[PDB]
């Protein structure tokens, strides 16, 4: 594929890894397998991550998709 | 055109010319974003009593104050030019977090 097709490939790759890494934090809280200060650290900064990922995700598909 | 022609070469995060206060104003929604999102499932797990009730309020306690230092910021007016485009983006792509938006209203 062409750069721009692999570097949009790769973020929602990486979209989907983001989701799934603060799902997994999420059901061991829920679980109490990991504290609330743990949680919490954690998941605001894959959540900062995540932020990013999709405003460049939007940035590039912008172009009515 | 085609895909390879739409998509051809590798789009940065941030226009080149993006301004130094601009960038800024991202980041901070970002910040903003990562406390909704964290907040949400704070909420969640509340409301099926897997956290301690004292650590509860703390920790929602400290999430409520930092969202305000970062709204109460970057001109004021320039973080809500971007609110209405990230939820037609969250819209779109069917993104909630209606239990932290709750919350927030009240704190
Ligand atoms: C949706 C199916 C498309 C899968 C495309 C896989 C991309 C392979 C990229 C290979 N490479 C090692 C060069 O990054
Ligand atoms: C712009 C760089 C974003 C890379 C995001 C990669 C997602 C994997 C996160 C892995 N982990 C759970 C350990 O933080
Ligand atoms: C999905 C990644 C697994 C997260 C497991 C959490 C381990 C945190 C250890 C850090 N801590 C200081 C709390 O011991
Ligand atoms: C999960 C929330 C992410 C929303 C991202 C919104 C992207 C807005 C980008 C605006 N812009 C004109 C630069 O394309
Ligand atoms: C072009 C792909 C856009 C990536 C963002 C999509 C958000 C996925 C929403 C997942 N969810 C199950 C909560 O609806
Ligand atoms: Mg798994």
Same mark, same amino acid.
């Given at each position: 594929? #062409? ?10 790759? @990486?979209?989907?890894?983001? #989701? ?12 109490? #397998?990991?504290?609330?200060?743990? /949680?919490?650290? @954690? ?6 991550? @995540? /932020? ?5 995700? @939007? ?7 | ?7 051809? *070469? ?7 010319? !993006? ?18 999102? &964290?907040?949400?499932?704070? =909420? ?6 897997? !956290? *301690? ?7 929602? *306690? ?14 004021? =007016? =320039? ?16 993104? &909630?977090?209606?239990?932290?938006? &709750? %919350?927030?209203? %009240?704190?």
């Amino acid at each position: 594929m #062409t750069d721009g097709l692999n570097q949009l490939y790769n973020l929602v790759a @990486q979209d989907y890894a983001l #989701t799934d890494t603060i799902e997994a934090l999420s059901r061991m809280l829920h679980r109490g #397998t990991i504290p609330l200060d743990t /949680f919490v650290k @954690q998941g605001r900064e894959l959540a900062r991550q @995540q /932020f990013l990922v999709r405003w460049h995700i @939007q940035r590039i598909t912008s172009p009515l998709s | 055109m085609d895909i390879s022609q739409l998509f051809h *070469d590798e789009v940065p995060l941030f226009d080149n010319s !993006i301004t130094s206060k601009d960038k800024e104003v991202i980041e901070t929604l970002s910040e903003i974003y990562s406390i909704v999102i &964290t907040l949400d499932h704070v =909420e969640k797990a509340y409301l099926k009593d897997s !956290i *301690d009730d004292t650590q509860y309020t703390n920790t929602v *306690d400290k999430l409520l104050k930092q969202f305000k230092v970062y709204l109460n910021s970057q001109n004021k =007016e =320039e973080i809500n030019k971007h609110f209405q485009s990230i939820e037609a983006f969250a819209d779109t792509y069917n993104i &909630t977090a209606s239990n932290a938006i &709750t %919350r927030l209203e %009240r704190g």
